[PDB]
Structure formats: structure tokens, C-alpha cells
Design a protein around this ligand. Structure first.
Ligand SMILES: CCCCCCCCCCCCCCCC(=O)OC[C@H](COP(=O)(O)O)OC(=O)CCCCCCCCCCCCCCC
Ligand SMILES: CCCCCCCCCCCCCCCC(=O)OC[C@H](COP(=O)(O)O)OC(=O)CCCCCCCCCCCCCCC
Ligand SMILES: [Ca+2]
Ligand SMILES: [Ca+2]
Lengths: 682, 518, 21, 76
């Protein structure tokens, strides 16, 4: 059964063709020379024959690393065709040297040129000898045959993102690596079918940058690399391009910590007790330091807050003072009486006000100096915007209540939507947001930092899962409300809903149903809310079954699926925990390196020495030879780093590899050709 | 007579047949051979459950062959020839039918499919999410106008605009959201009738709901016809749709019965159980839940919620097995608790009996009530004083409280955590093939919108067509292509080139890239 | 690097033998 | 587009230098001895030449485990 016959394998070789191809396989120089010289008097051989699996004589010699046979075959004018491409793809430097100077079916997509394929292989010798000839690589655009176009763009981006080609070309390999990683990251969004591939390419670029910066042997040279165009400009550029590995390089972090302390030799050899005491000490006198920087910003103490760690401590202390003021705002000992519309704000709120104004001013300055796109990329910035909007609402509502409600009356008799009541509500919400803004100050801590960053990195999966849960919630709310809205009850009870001792109507309105099904997932909804004031046991049973199915779906199915997805997320997230945390800590640290934004918010709003000169003039709009010297000195540094990188990760890393079956075949072929020579010459 | 030799020989001649080299040297169409052979090996992994693993592995290998034979395409015209081989996209539909997930999820297939998914929207990759959102809401908002144009003038510059798969997907989604919003309005006291009315004489909202219900039933009937009844139930969403439409049919029938048997009106509190109107409201509410859950299937279209929704659907089978075990545990403890407590069933005093009451009285006095008590015990909604009786029998109460406590230990701190553990193991593997499975599901969803049939949304689905009687009367009245050969040869040349490339690039070079042994 | 060493030993052996006969 | 040119790869080898480094690669003791003895009468070879990726003749012999060539090179 099933007789087996050859299909789509047309060509078969004659005995002479097999003998000659076998001679080329074995390395037999004498037999190949003989068969080739017998291929010109009376041909009868088809010098360019093709074995099974293709594998032409020239290509065979290329696969065997036999240069003598390659020179002979080229001397007898064989059809090279794609010989150069197979030589390059196999990283065969000698054959590439021979085929570069020598005067339908293919294994390569017709858009593949020699330089593109060489850069794909990342072999520095072949790329070097191709570039000297004068090759060029096409330039794709910013960011009829869709398959060919997408494949060609991928091929010329994989060539461009090659450490060897970036090292042989591209005046600044660092800028090229940054820009190319950014471009590939964007393309992994535009070309979502090849996303993975582009992402991998992007990742590769990032490591190149890191591994090009690991070749620094001196802190002066590393400082030159990082301060290239106020200061630390190239590091800020790396931050902007999201080069996490480049930033988290150990030498970068060491230099950054040295600039983070600036007056505190130690803090590594110091015991945690002295650290804690001195941080509390400086935090306690933050107002004095800020005052000195206000009045005499050049003294032995006015410059002390200019140090990034000191001013980070001062900002943290001012924020903790603010939060403690919010805590005092809810104490009956320093508040006014509740039976007062238009409260005429107390002392604590007055003291709170400068912090609020300073926070708003800081957020405005960030929104200006940095734009509005980069500003919202940080979620803490969105939280700050909501916080300050809520405080503005508090101030406005208090003002409105003061100029419209001059009378006092007991609070129980007040009417809903009273400006004072809404003011207290929005102020409380703003208090929650202000106190949550305190978790961002843990990227500075080496223990709570990686954890806080990783928890922030799990939120997106939580949001997707919560969107699915909201759909499930809406489905069951629709059903339960449809079942129960005919038995809405008012007579008797004086408090209606689920927020009452005897939980009455729970599915009688869509809003109330939504709350009931929300609080059901914490067990705060009793089982007797599924009853009605009638003997309708069927409707009650159906409602209890909707409610029970919702609890099964949400509490023992979806919740556990959330646990499973979180576990999968945290497996990967914890791998890049230190890298991401160090990126975040670098951002936090670098935010305290500038001269702007030095005073904490309470002192932020203080009329400066001029205070009108940069205020009036700001609205009134309606011979550096050091640059070239810096550029050349950076060029020498970069030359040395690229030399070191090529030596230590292209020449030695390639050597440290694992030899495949092709290496055994090459060894066997060398032994066989040696054998044939010796036997034939004696 | 010799089971060992027979099974081993069959395995040996299936492992030979499922060989990329042998499929490339023989088998006029390697694609059809790979599809059929993967299907056969998948079935044998069920029949021969002792060698299951092995057969499954073989099946998997076949699938990759198909994928890796399609990765050898260098042109979109040649790939189109491969996929349109026998209306259109026939070979891709065949791959869908044989469950060739890797072949379907090949990047070039997906690129071609997306190009056919948009058809009027150059961009949508370079466009910002804001413009996308605005234009989808815009087209969804005027879905009725587009459907009307396709009704009256299905050849104009606007009648053909709904013919585009993405546009008609947006139109169907908009009609479904309109339906769900109508169900939401159905439970508002501002557009409903009074509760003290038997035989409600359906209101305006229910009247507007009716065309959607009829269109949904008609769509489900057409799917059950054009596709058979075996492939139809393989999709679980189809079973959910069948239940939904059965429930809506029950709602209509019960409302009709109540209208022709209960012409009087009386307060609802005095109604009797099993009243047709009450049952109508109950089944309508259940159907509302199912209709609103039918909205999660429209997330396979989304690249963010799609892989997640598919993976969550892929964990359900383990949940079902675990819940079967839990139901046995539940039945065991229900039997025990009912046996202990059924002598103290109490009626005097209380007016509401069971656990659904403020003071939770008899909770283990009947088997049904015991089942409910033990079900709600796992959410903490059953109080601890239901284990007491009206007697001083502290021994029976203690034994009952110990049964109840052992059931809570087994279910809430043992079985539930075992479920978490099994789910974690499942999701480890499931998330590996997340993109492949999601892209298969999205291809199915997309391809369902490529045909001319089923273009109008359900409210407009039930509209007498221009003829409307010609294909209705005639349907029941039963009781020289030389392009074919040319297409076949052109496909043969394409296939020759792909097999040549595959042999060159994965048999000759992949073998070379290996690791030399001793 | 071990394959490269082996190939180099074979080549040097080859050159010696060919050069001494 | 994107014309590609060599940067920061200054030094390139003459034909004699490539021949001598290739001889050191292949292990050719006779060729290396000849080129080194021809590197003292009329040098014209730059005995300490450097290949791409560095990889000097002595370093090449070190990477090839060739002790004979190493002794010869040190002898010169
Ligand atoms: C270890 C925890 C296990 C969790 C419990 C498993 C349920 C086992 C069956 C319990 C039956 C006992 C009660 C019998 C009496 C009765 O009628 O009671 C029915 C009970 C409560 O009703 P009553 O109190 O009125 O009797 O309700 C239910 O039992 C509903 C259970 C439905 C299970 C649904 C699971 C499907 C998985 C969800 C898919 C995920 C995505 C979905 C989103 C779209
Ligand atoms: C961290 C969570 C740990 C969970 C709790 C562990 C239980 C520890 C022991 C508690 C004892 C304290 C109470 C002592 C007084 C008393 O008599 O109280 C007994 C309590 C409650 O009874 P009372 O309220 O009447 O006193 O009941 C129990 O303690 C029952 C516990 C039994 C544990 C069973 C575990 C076996 C694992 C299940 C196998 C899985 C599959 C099974 C399906 C077939
Ligand atoms: Ca901010
Ligand atoms: Ca269906």
C-alpha cells in the first residue's frame, strides 16, 4: 500500500557528476583538477552540476572551508551566483576575500545584499572588508507587496542594529544605539505582527550601549562619556531614551552616588544608627537650611542644601510636616465647631495653604520645563495633578461658602450638596492622595525600592483583569436589577439601601445593585437581601442563584485567576527588579541635582531677591573654542572604548562558543584533503 | 491477536508518514497531507490513550511543518495563491477547520488578514488611539444609517461601506451595545409599567427589544444550518447563545400566555407562586445576564484583553474538574449534616424559614436547605448559630459544629488553595501559547466578518429582502472552466518553490547547525 | 577555540610534511 | 542611501603583512621563518604588524597553541 514516488525532485546526477562532486566533498585537489580539465576538451560533465539539497561544487568547497579548491574552481569560471552570500552567511573570511575580487532559484530573499547579510552575521572581519569596497545600506523611512516590504525593512533594521556595523561606522555609537533602540521600540508597536522580533532587536541595541560603557577603565573617561552635549547631559539623554541597562551600569551608579552625597564621605561604612540620627537631625532643621538658602545662598550653610542628598532629606521632611498637618486637621482640639457654615479657615488650614500653593507651583513648573507628553508618562505626576486639582477645589469651595453662608446652624439640619460639605469631602480625598504620594519616596530605599517598583509594574495586569471583572459585574447587575426592581419598597424603613443595619433594597435600582454586587465580594452583603416582602419563593430562589453564581464567578474563579496571572507576572518582573529599581532611583536622584527646585514647597513660594525681574521680563516677549576641543577629546575616548569593545566582545566572545556539526565536517575534510595530497605525491 | 506488535507497527508507520522529508519528496500537496496527518494523529492520541503523549508530539510536529512550510514565502502574491486555493481564503478556512494554530498565527498570514480586515483604512497602525476611538464611536453611532443604506442601495458609495469587515464588526458591536442598553432600560421604573398588572401587555422598551431577539434567533438558526451541528457546539459561546435565545423564547411565550389567561390586575404581593408573569420576569432576567456576558467574546478583537480572555477561557476545564470534586465533598457533608439535624426541624414561631432570613433558622433540616447552607458557608454568609437546636443537646450541637467546621477547613483552606495551585500550574503553560491561541481566536472572529452573508446587524437582520419570497418559496421547493487547471498548475509551481526552499533552509542548514556527539 | 587548535595542528603537520618531501 | 565608510579602524595591512600573518595562522613554520629572515636584511614588513581585531603574530601563535612558532618569534 501507498506506493512512494519522487515528486518535485527533478534533477538527478550522472556518474561523472557524482564522482566530481564527491571529489570536491573529500577535498581531492588532484581529482577535481583532473575532472575540471576534462570538462573543457569534451565537456559531458555539466561543470555547474547541483547535488541533492542544492549544494553546488563551489558551495560545497565554501562549506568545507577549502580555499585551494575555491581558487581552482574560480580559475575555471564556474557560476558563482550566490557564492558570496553563502560564504558570508557561513562567516568564511577566506572565501569572502576570494569572491570579492573575481572577474531561477536562490537561498536568499532578493532584498538581501552582501553588507546586509554580513551585518546579520555580526562578523567584524567580513563587514570590515565589505565596507572598504564601498557598499551601502538602504535607509528606511521614519517609522503593493506587504510581505516583501515588511521583510526588507526588518532585514535592514537587523543589519543597522549590529554591534559590528555600529562600531565600524556611525560617528557616535552611543547616539546611534539610543536612537535605534527607540526606533525599534516604536516599530514593535506599528508592526505588531513582527513585534517580538523588533523588541528583541531593540533589546540587543540596549545591551550594546551597556556593553560599550563597561569598557571604561577610568572615572575621568567615564565622566567624559556621561558629560557630553547643564551637566550629566548624556546620562539625561539615556534616561529620556529609557536605556535602563546603560543607566544601571555599576560605574554609572557609582559616579551618581558620589554626586548624590557630595559632603558625606562614608554612608557606606557608617552604621545605620548614625545614618538615622543624622537624617532625622537634618530633617528637623530643614526650615533653617531653607531660610539660609533664601537669605544667604553663598555661605557655609546656604550651600549645604545645594547638596542632592541634603535637599532630598529637606523635601522629605517638608512633606512629612505637611502630612502631619493634614493629620492635625482632623483633630477636635485644633478645629472649629461643626455647626458653622462658612468656616473661616482655622490656623491649621492657614499653615496648610503655603504647602498647597508650593505644590501647585512645583507641578506647574514641571508641566512647563519638560512639556506635557513626558509629564504624563509618570503616573505619580497624574496623581499630583489630581491632588492639586482637589486642593484648588477645596479652596474655591471654602471661599464660596464663606461669601454665601454667613450663618451658623446645626450640621444635622444642613442640606445635601452644601458647599462646606463638598469642601470637606474633596479635602478628605485630597488627603488620601497626599498621603499616598509618600510611597514614591521609597525608590530611594534599597529595601523597599525594588519591591515598590515591581508592585507598580504589576498594576497593568490588574487593570485588564478589573476591566473584565467590571463587565461580569455589569452583567449580573443587569440581571439582578431586572429580577428585583418590581419589589422596590419604601414604607416602614427610614434608611434605604445596603448601608444600613437591616440591609433593605439591594437590587431595586441599578446603582444600588452595583454597590451590592461590589460589596458582595468582601462578604459585607447579607444573605437576606435576596428576599422580598412577598411569598414568591421562586423569584427569591432565582435571585439567590444569580447572587450565588456571581460570588462563585468573582470570589472563587476570577480572584484566583488574578492570583495566577499575578504570579506569572511577578516571575518575570522580579528578574529585572534591580535594573528597573536603579533606573527609577536614578530618575529620583537626578531630579535633585539641579539648582532649580531647591527650596521645599513651603519656602518655594517666596519672592526671590528680584521676584519681579524674572516675573516681568519673562512675559515681555509677545567664540567657544572649548566645544571643538571637548568634541575631539570625546572622540579619542570613544575610539578607545570601541577598540576595547571589539577586542573583548567580538574577538574573545566569538572564540568562547560551542562548535557545531559543521566544525567536525571541516576537520574531517581537512584530514581527508591532507590524506589525498600525501598519497598522491608519494 | 498481538496488541503490542500492532500498536508499535502503527506508531512506526505514522512516525514515518509524519516526516518533513518524506512529505516533501512525496505527497502531491504537502499542506493537505500535513493538515490531515495532524488531525489523524490528534484523534489517535484519544483512541490510543496509552501512547497518547507520543502521538500528540507527532501531531505537533506536523503542525510546525505546515507553519515552517509557509514561512518560506517571499511574496504576497505567492502567499495569496497558497491561501486562496480550492469562496475566497479557502485554504485558510481549511487550516482553521483542522485547528492549525501555528499556520494561522504565522506573521505573514496575519498581515494579509489585517489588510483584508480594514480595506478602507490605510493607517490604523500609525494612527493615534484618540482618532481611532473617535472614529469607532462615530461609525458605531451611525450604524443604523449604514445598515439602512445597505438595505435600500447595496451598491452605492455608502451601501458598500458596511461591506468592509472592520466597519461591519463595529456595526454589529454597536447594535449589540444598543441591545444591552435597552435591557438596562427595561429595569427602570420610568419606562416600565406598574407591578400590579397580570398580563403586562408589553411596553415600548420590550417592543423595541423584540426585533433584536428575533434577529439573534435567526442568526443562531443560520449558524446551526450553515456549518452543521457538531462544529456549531464546539464553540462554547454558541452554547451560551443557544441558552440565551431559548430563554428569550420562553420569555415571549410566557408573556403571551399571561396575556391570554390573566386579564385582571391585582397587587403583586398577593400573587401566587409560579405565576406566568413572575416566571417570565425570572427567565428574562437570566437571559439578560447571558446577553450581557456575551459581551466578553468581543475582546478577542483587542490585543490587550484578547490574550487574557482566551487564557482565562483555557483555564475553565481545570475549574470544572475541581468543582466536580468539590460537589462530591459538598454532597458528603450535606448528607451527614442533614442526617444529624433533620429531627429538629422547626416551624412554630418564625414566619420565614431557611438561611435567607435575618435570623437564620433551620439550615440543615432538609437536604436542599443543607446544600444551600454548605454552599453559602464558603463565603461566610452562614452564621455560627445555625448549628444550634431548640434543645439542650450540647452533644449533637457540638457534633454538628464539628461537621460544619471540618467542611469549612476542607473547602476554604484546603480545596480552595489546591485550586489556586492547579490554576498556577495551568497558567504557567497556558501563557506560553497565549499569542498563538489568541491570534487563532482573533482570526476566527475576523473571518466571520469576511462573508457577504450576515452583513446586517440583528435589528435589521429581519427585514424582507428585495425578493424576500423568492429565496423563501424556492428554498423549500425541493422535496468549461479551464481556469481551474491553470490555477492548479500555478499553485503547483508555487508549492515546488516553497518545498525547495524548505528543504534547503531547514533540512540542509538546520541539520548543519547541530551539536557533535561522541 | 579547541576546534581552531585542532585545525591549526593539522595544517602545521601538513605544511611540514609537504615541505620536507 | 546611507553610504557606509570606515571609522576608527585606521591601520590596514600590506600584502606582505597579510601573507606573514596568514602563515602564522596556518602554522607554516617555513614561511614564517622565511618572512622573518627577510625582515632583517630589508625590513619592509613591520614584523610587529597588527591584524584586524588586534591579534598580533605572537598573540596569534599563542591563540593557536603553537609553541614552535612562539619560540621562533621570540628568537627574532
Ligand atoms: C472550593 C470552592 C468551590 C466553589 C463552589 C463550587 C460550586 C459547587 C456547586 C454548589 C451547588 C450547591 C447549592 C445547591 C442548591 C442551590 O440551588 O443553590 C444554588 C446556589 C445558591 O442558590 P440558593 O441559595 O438560592 O440555593 O448558587 C449556585 O450554586 C451557583 C453556582 C454556579 C457555579 C458557576 C461556576 C462557573 C465558572 C465561571 C466561569 C468563569 C468566567 C465567567 C465570567 C463570564
Ligand atoms: C492557616 C489556616 C489553618 C486552618 C485551620 C487548621 C485546623 C487546626 C485545628 C483546629 C482545632 C481547634 C478547635 C478545637 C475545639 C473543637 O472541637 O472545634 C472543632 C472545630 C469546630 O468545632 P466546634 O466549634 O464545635 O468546637 O472543627 C474542627 O476543628 C475541624 C477541623 C478538621 C481539620 C480537617 C483537615 C483535613 C484535610 C482535608 C483533606 C483534603 C481532602 C478532603 C476531601 C475528601
Ligand atoms: Ca511631579
Ligand atoms: Ca453563534
Amino acid at each position: 500500500r501507498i506506493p512512494l514516488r519522487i515528486v518535485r525532485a527533478e534533477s538527478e546526477l550522472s556518474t561523472q557528476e557524482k564522482s566530481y562532486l564527491s571529489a570536491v566533498e573529500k577535498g581531492d585537489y588532484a581529482s577535481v583538477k583532473l575532472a575540471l580539465e576534462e570538462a573543457e576538451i569534451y565537456f559531458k560533465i555539466n561543470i555547474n552540476c547541483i547535488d541533492p539539497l542544492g549544494r553546488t561544487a563551489l558551495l560545497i568547497a565554501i562549506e568545507n572551508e577549502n580555499l585551494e579548491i575555491i581558487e581552482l574552481l574560480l580559475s575555471f569560471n564556474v557560476y558563482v551566483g550566490d557564492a558570496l552570500l553563502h560564504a558570508i552567511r557561513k562567516e568564511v573570511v577566506g572565501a569572502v576575500e576570494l569572491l570579492l575580487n573575481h572577474k531561477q532559484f536562490s537561498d536568499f530573499t532578493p532584498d538581501i545584499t552582501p553588507i546586509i547579510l554580513a551585518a546579520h552575521t555580526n562578523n567584524y572581519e567580513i563587514i570590515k572588508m565589505l565596507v572598504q569596497k564601498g557598499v551601502s545600506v538602504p535607509q528606511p523611512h521614519e517609522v503593493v507587496d506587504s510581505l516583501r516590504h515588511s521583510r526588507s525593512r526588518l532585514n535592514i533594521y537587523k543589519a543597522l542594529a549590529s554591534p559590528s556595523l555600529i562600531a565600524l561606522s556611525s560617528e557616535d555609537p552611543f547616539l546611534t544605539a539610543f536612537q535605534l533602540s527607540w526606533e525599534l521600540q516604536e516599530l514593535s508597536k506599528v508592526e505588531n505582527e513582527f513585534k517580538a522580533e523588533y523588541e528583541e532587536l531593540s533589546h540587543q541595541c540596549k545591551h550594546f550601549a551597556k556593553d560599550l560603557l563597561d569598557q571604561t577603565r577610568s572615572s575621568r573617561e567615564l565622566e567624559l562619556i556621561l558629560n557630553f552635549r547643564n551637566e550629566l547631559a548624556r546620562l539625561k539623554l539615556a534616561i529620556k531614551y529609557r536605556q535602563k541597562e546603560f543607566v544601571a551600569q555599576p560605574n554609572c551608579q557609582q559616579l551618581l552616588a558620589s554626586r548624590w552625597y557630595d559632603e558625606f564621605p562614608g554612608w557606606r561604612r557608617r552604621h545605620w544608627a548614625g545614618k538615622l540620627i543624622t537624617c532625622v537631625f537634618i530633617g528637623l532643621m530643614f526650615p533653617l537650611l531653607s531660610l539660609c538658602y533664601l537669605v544667604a545662598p553663598k555661605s557655609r550653610y546656604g550651600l549645604f542644601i545645594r547638596k542632592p542628598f541634603i535637599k532630598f532629606i529637606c523635601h522629605t521632611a517638608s512633606y512629612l510636616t505637611f502630612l502631619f498637618l493634614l493629620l492635625l486637621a482632623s483633630q477636635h482640639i485644633v478645629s472649629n465647631n461643626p455647626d458653622r457654615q462658612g468656616p473661616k479657615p482655622t490656623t491649621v488650614e492657614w499653615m496648610i495653604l503655603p504647602w498647597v500653593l508650593g505644590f501647585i507651583w512645583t507641578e506647574i513648573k514641571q508641566m512647563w520645563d519638560g512639556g506635557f507628553q513626558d509629564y504624563i508618562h509618570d503616573w505619580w505626576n497624574l496623581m499630583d495633578f489630581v491632588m492639586n486639582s482637589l486642593y484648588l477645589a477645596t479652596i474655591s469651595l471654602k471661599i464660596v461658602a464663606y461669601v454665601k453662608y454667613s450663618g451658623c446652624k446645626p450640621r444635622d439640619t444642613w442640606e445635601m450638596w452644601h458647599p462646606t460639605l463638598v469642601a470637606e469631602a474633596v479635602f478628605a480625598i485630597a488627603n488620601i492622595f497626599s498621603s499616598l504620594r509618600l510611597i514614591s519616596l521609597f525608590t530611594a530605599n534599597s529595601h523597599l525600592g525594588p519591591l515598590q517598583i515591581s508592585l507598580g509594574r504589576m498594576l497593568l495586569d490588574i487593570l485588564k483583569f478589573l476591566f473584565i471583572y467590571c463587565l461580569v459585574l455589569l452583567a449580573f447587575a443587569n440581571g439582578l436589577n431586572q429580577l428585583y426592581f418590581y419589589y422596590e419598597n419604601s414604607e416602614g424603613m427610614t434608611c434605604k439601601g445596603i448601608r444600613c443595619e437591616r440591609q433593605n433594597n439591594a437590587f431595586s435600582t441599578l446603582f444600588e445593585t452595583l454597590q451590592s454586587l461590589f460589596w458582595s465580594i468582601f462578604g459585607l452583603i447579607s444573605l437576606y437581601v435576596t428576599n422580598v416582602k412577598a411569598d414568591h419563593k421562586f423569584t427569591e430562589f432565582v435571585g439567590a442563584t444569580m447572587f450565588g453564581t456571581y460570588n462563585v464567578i468573582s470570589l472563587v474563579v476570577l480572584l484566583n485567576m488574578l492570583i495566577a496571572m499575578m504570579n506569572n507576572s511577578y516571575q518575570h518582573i522580579a528578574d529585572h527588579a534591580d535594573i528597573e529599581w536603579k533606573f527609577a532611583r536614578t530618575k529620583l536622584w537626578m531630579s535633585y541635582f539641579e539648582e532649580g527646585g531647591t527650596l521645599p514647597p513651603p519656602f518655594n513660594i517666596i519672592p526671590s531677591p528680584k521676584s519681579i525681574c524674572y516675573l516681568i521680563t519673562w512675559i515681555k516677549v509677545h567664540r567657544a573654542a572649548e566645544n571643538v576641543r571637548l568634541n575631539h577629546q570625546y572622540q579619542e575616548v570613544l575610539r578607545n572604548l570601541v577598540k576595547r569593545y571589539v577586542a573583548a566582545m567580538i574577538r574573545d566572545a566569538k572564540t568562547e562558543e560551542g562548535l557545531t556539526e559543521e566544525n567536525f565536517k571541516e576537520l574531517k575534510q581537512d584530514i581527508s584533503s591532507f590524506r589525498y595530497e600525501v598519497i598522491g605525491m608519494m
